[PDB]
Design a protein around this nucleic acid. Structure first.
Ligand SMILES: Nc1ncnc2c1ncn2[C@@H]1O[C@H](COP(=O)(O)OP(=O)(O)O)[C@@H](O)[C@H]1O
Ligand SMILES: Nc1ncnc2c1ncn2[C@@H]1O[C@H](COP(=O)(O)OP(=O)(O)O)[C@@H](O)[C@H]1O
Lengths: 100, 417, 100, 259, 259
DNA sequence: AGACGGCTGGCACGACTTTTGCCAGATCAGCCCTGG
DNA sequence: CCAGGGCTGATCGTGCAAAAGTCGTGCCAGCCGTCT
């Protein structure tokens, strides 16, 4: 697909050195990148070595922390577990700052 | 007459931006449509064993290298070898020219003779003569391998050498006078040549998938067979209730408005997609009614038709039917076809009747195939055969059709009995 | 395109097809060892352009034109026995019935 | 370089000199106008006028003021663009536009409605014309040829014809000699006619002319020069229409009684 | 606008005042009427006068009063808008709107139809003009140049010319002299054209004229002014056919019989 | 060995299909303001 | 407190026609089979 899962221009090339587009398909090109398709002409195995990233503009916590036997965010902020679990779901409205 | 700028009357036409979008909506395939429709759904907020088997396979090219590894050679010989067998097809002859491969090496030391060597070393590997670089010699290599003892060997070797043109135009009269071979004994040399496996690489890859999704379905329940659309395929939008119950009680004008506008959109889009579907079923249905014929009968029994034929059975305009037919495939007992397909040109037969070209072109294919192989039927001879049937096609029509079915001429399909 | 059992398998010897009948199934009562072919099925390949190479190959040999692939039912390795009986079920609408 | 002689004969007298005039006219790209009696072979020498000249491959298209019609007259000359006026489904090329790089024949100049002359008055000078109901203009270089039945100069005094129009045309004139001015070529044109007609009716051969014919031929005034002469001889031949003794009677007039 | 250089061969007393008269007028916006006798050289002045004026890159656009069709007359003069009538498909720019900031040079207006006189007059004096079916009035300055050989003062009395149209039209009318009147300038022009003609017909050069020829051509009614001179020297040159001796043959009238 | 007849295929020219491109407007009903 | 007037917004609308495309059949050129 285009700009998605199992897509081109991400995660590497396809089964052969040939570009998805259709041009620049041979061993003569080793590191060049075409204009109609942006795909590095390399081996297929490198597909299992290239990962992807997602922006996720909205912040998101890691469930491995603050949900195990010890609470990391809890021990860092001196905050109980119930309050953090209630504030990580838009139903607590904790206060950030304000000294006046 | 006279020239002036007067006014006429009696007509009907109306359109708008939003309605337009609703109309183009049915012209594009569900799969490609559902994409367009997913995109709508981001914009509108109120509208809603790990490796299993994973058996890595052989792959031919992969097979070629496994023996490259246990062939003995140098680094330069193993480098050219990877180059050569890199550039080889599923069929098995090589894609690039050999002088091209020299440009891929980029080495002054590398020479054509050196390449001729590594190539030919790996040219008799597995299976026989693979990496051919333009068949003629591939055949020549497989000939090469087996024993002198088999008769007619030198004959097949002479022909294959430099008399290819003679065999491709099937002009055996010329072949006989050129090669000065035996009369109707050469036949068996040619038969040897015939059983030599052209395209020896193909063999490896065979595992090919099943893949086609029928839009509509039509299937012989007691006669009068009935069309129903594909349930799984058909796209569907459903109103979000949460957000529907959060427009009224809303305290702000921003929010309230916001929610109304979207609901408006959304209800409209639903109604438009709903439309697409109904059209297409009404229409499916109306095309197979007329073309009742065809399912049982075959491609021969198709009546010749135009959109008008199917548009006037419905109440919609012609263009509309034209937009809804593109890229929809409807599955039936007989197979999967595109909905376009039914529609074709007619030609006028004897007895006032007309015949669908498709059906005649199916007819020509059976007739031409089922003929004495010593004497091929020429086009005009057929025209005459059809005329007996009543079709009265003419000869260029039939050439056209006969060359469309990817079948070459009569003088060109002539062969030894 | 549809797949049919016509015993017209390319890239195979006559010895293998010596036990296959017209439609492609094996005669009742025969024996089979190793990886012999039982039912000869082929898978169609997509049409191509003029293709001067394939055009020449079809003008010379013919009847194949790389249209079908060898996808015949063969016995798995390490299996030896004799066939008791065959059976064929065809859906409604299709009336090929070579030897059914 | 093709001669295109076609049916050219009757070369005995002065006519031969006018051939010898118009003969280098084609190379020149100027106004050219001819004057002759109706049917004094007024077309055939103006057609020849195009093939001989440079663009001998230029498209040939031709019009007459006598026909044309009062209405579509404006549209037919300059031509009309599409949608310019109601009922105009597609753009239609103008008559002037039709022939570009080719000579256009003009006839019945002697008549010409005051309306017709004015519209084409500036079309042929700077070679510029704009289609009716057209946003833009077009430029062409066509070689106008005119032909008349009558005396243009006398008409100019009366005013049934503009001086300006006269000036643009008539670079050189060419007066075809009246056939009855000939006296020589009667007989060769004669004989040619003879033979054609005998040929068409699938008769074996031509017998001759029987002097009485010859005598009476000279006497007639001959109003249409090569156009009643041909016709006369076809219509006389048909009355005989055999292969024996030559024909003696002259069907000068077909509304005369058989008896 | 700094340099303009084409034609205008004549260099005589009369042609001097008029040429220098054009120069004064060209800067000024006001419309100028070009009157005269046929063939004097009006398409010269009007073209050249247009650009001497301060608008030269602006569109310049001609027509013929007589040429435009009577039925579409409103559209030719002004134009339409898409949807106005069964025939039209889009807004139509008109000659009056085609001429924004440029100049409109009517040609041979003296023959313009009765309707034509009653169309352009109101929109010319002011610049107000409503497009056929247009919602609002369209306003434009199109410099006006128009010229004709007729005599308007004589014509207005007859009643074939609207009165005032001759009147809000005529500021600084320009009058050219005839060929017979210049006399001194005639010799230079003959040499020019000839050399031009002879060069056109793959000829080397000019022989020059003789005293006979000089005298002959000098004294003439010289009717068509410039149009006729060039005709004559340019027909005579064709007939001479060579440069071996001086040119002597004069063809004045083409039309009375060559022996 | 040369001419004649047959074959095929390219290209052209009407008769005929089909495919893409439009872009609101007026009219009716409920609620709010105001007169009776 | 009840009836009259204004005004906004909500609602209804899948075709007509213009140009590009395909269709069938004829015309003509070039290759090849066969008799004299
Ligand atoms: N010298 C000539 N030799 C042969 N035929 C001639 C000659 N002059 C004229 N004709 C013939 O005379 C008849 C004259 O045609 P003409 O009357 O001039 O046409 P138009 O009426 O259109 O000017 C023609 O059909 C033509 O073939
Ligand atoms: N001084 C001049 N210089 C060059 N050519 C001239 C002159 N006077 C007249 N002419 C010519 O004769 C013709 C001009 O037409 P013109 O007098 O426009 O006719 P009208 O006045 O009738 O438009 C031209 O072909 C132009 O060469």
């Amino acid at each position: 697909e285009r700009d998605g899962l199992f897509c081109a221009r991400i995660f590497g090339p396809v089964k052969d050195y040939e570009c998805l587009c259709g041009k620049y398909k041979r061993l003569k090109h080793r590191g060049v990148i075409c204009e109609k398709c942006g795909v590095e002409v390399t081996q297929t195995k490198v597909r299992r070595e290239r990962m992807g990233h997602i922006e996720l503009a909205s912040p998101t916590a890691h469930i491995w922390f603050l949900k195990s036997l010890p609470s990391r965010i809890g021990l860092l902020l001196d905050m109980p577990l119930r309050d953090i679990e209630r504030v990580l779901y838009f139903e607590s409205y904790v206060v950030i700052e304000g000294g006046m | 007459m006279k020239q002036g700028l007067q006014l006429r009357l009696s007509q009907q036409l109306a359109m708008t931006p939003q309605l337009q979008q609703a109309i183009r909506l049915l012209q594009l395939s569900t799969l490609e449509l559902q994409q367009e429709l997913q995109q709508a759904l981001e914009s509108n907020p109120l509208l809603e064993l790990p490796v299993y088997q994973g058996e890595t396979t052989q792959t031919l090219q992969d097979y070629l290298m496994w023996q490259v590894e246990l062939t003995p050679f140098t680094d330069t010989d193993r480098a050219i070898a990877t180059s050569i067998v890199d550039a080889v097809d599923d069929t098995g002859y090589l894609t690039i020219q050999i002088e091209d491969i020299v440009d891929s090496i980029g080495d002054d030391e590398i020479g054509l003779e050196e390449v001729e060597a590594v190539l030919k070393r790996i040219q008799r590997f597995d299976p026989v003569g693979v990496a051919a670089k333009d068949l003629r010699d591939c055949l020549l290599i497989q000939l090469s391998q087996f024993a002198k003892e088999t008769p007619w060997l030198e004959e097949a070797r002479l022909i294959i050498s430099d008399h290819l043109d003679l065999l491709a135009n099937h002009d055996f009269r010329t072949l006989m006078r050129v090669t000065r071979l035996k009369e109707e004994v050469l036949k068996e040399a040619v038969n040897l040549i015939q059983s030599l496996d052209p395209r020896p690489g193909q063999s490896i890859q065979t595992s090919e998938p099943e893949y086609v999704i029928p839009d509509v379905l039509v299937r012989k329940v007691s006669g009068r067979w009935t069309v129903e659309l594909n349930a799984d395929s058909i796209p569907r939008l459903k109103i979000n209730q949460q957000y529907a119950a959060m427009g009224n009680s809303a305290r702000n004008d921003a929010d309230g408005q916001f929610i109304r506008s979207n609901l408006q959109e959304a209800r409209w889009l639903i109604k438009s997609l709903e439309s697409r579907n109904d059209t297409l079923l009404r229409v499916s249905r109306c095309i197979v009614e007329q073309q009742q014929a065809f399912f049982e009968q075959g491609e021969e029994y198709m009546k010749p038709m135009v959109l008008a034929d199917i548009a006037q059975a419905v109440e919609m305009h012609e263009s509309t039917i034209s937009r809804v037919t593109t890229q929809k495939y409807l599955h039936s007992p007989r197979g999967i076809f595109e909905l376009k397909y039914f529609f074709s040109s007619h030609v006028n037969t004897e007895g006032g009747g007309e015949a669908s070209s498709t059906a005649i072109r199916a007819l020509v294919k059976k007739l031409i195939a089922a003929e004495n192989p010593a004497k091929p039927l020429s086009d005009s001879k057929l025209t005459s055969m059809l005329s007996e049937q009543g079709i009265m096609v003419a000869r260029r029509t039939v050439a056209k059709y006969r060359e469309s079915l990817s079948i070459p001429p009569s003088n060109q399909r002539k062969q030894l009995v | 395109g549809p797949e049919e059992i016509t015993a017209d398998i390319p890239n195979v010897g006559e010895a293998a097809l010596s036990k296959l009948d017209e439609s492609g199934i094996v005669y009742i009562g025969a024996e089979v060892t190793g990886g012999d072919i039982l039912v000869g099925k082929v898978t169609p390949k997509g049409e191509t352009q003029l293709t001067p190479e394939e055009k020449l190959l079809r003008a010379i040999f013919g009847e194949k034109a790389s249209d079908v692939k060898d996808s015949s039912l063969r016995v798995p390795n390490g299996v030896s026995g004799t066939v008791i009986d065959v059976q064929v079920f065809t859906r409604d609408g299709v009336e090929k019935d070579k030897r059914a | 370089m093709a001669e295109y002689k076609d049916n050219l004969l009757g070369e005995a007298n002065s006519f031969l000199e006018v051939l010898e005039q118009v003969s280098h006219l084609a190379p020149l790209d100027k106004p050219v106008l001819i004057i002759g009696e109706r049917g004094t072979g007024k077309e055939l020498i103006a057609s020849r006028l195009h093939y001989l000249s440079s663009r001998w491959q230029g498209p040939f298209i031709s019009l007459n003021c006598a026909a044309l019609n009062e209405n579509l007259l404006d549209s037919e000359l300059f031509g009309h663009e599409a949608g310019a006026f109601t009922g105009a489904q597609k753009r239609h090329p103008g008559r002037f536009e039709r022939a570009d790089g080719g000579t256009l024949f003009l006839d019945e100049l002697a008549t010409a409605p005051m309306m017709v002359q004015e519209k084409l008055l500036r079309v042929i000078e700077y070679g510029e014309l704009e289609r009716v109901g057209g946003s833009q203009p077009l430029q062409v270089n066509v070689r106008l040829v005119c032909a008349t039945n009558a005396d243009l100069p006398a008409m100019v005094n009366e005013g049934t014809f503009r001086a300006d129009l006269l000036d643009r045309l008539a670079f050189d004139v060419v007066q075809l000699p009246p056939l009855r001015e000939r006296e020589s070529d009667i007989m060769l044109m004669a004989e040619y006619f003879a033979i054609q007609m005998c040929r068409e009716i699938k008769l074996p051969l031509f017998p001759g002319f029987t002097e009485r014919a010859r005598e009476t031929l000279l006497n007639y005034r001959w109003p249409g020069n090569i156009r009643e002469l041909k016709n006369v001889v076809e219509r006389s031949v048909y009355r005989h229409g055999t292969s024996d003794y030559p024909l003696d009677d002259i069907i000068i007039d077909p509304f005369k009684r058989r008896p």
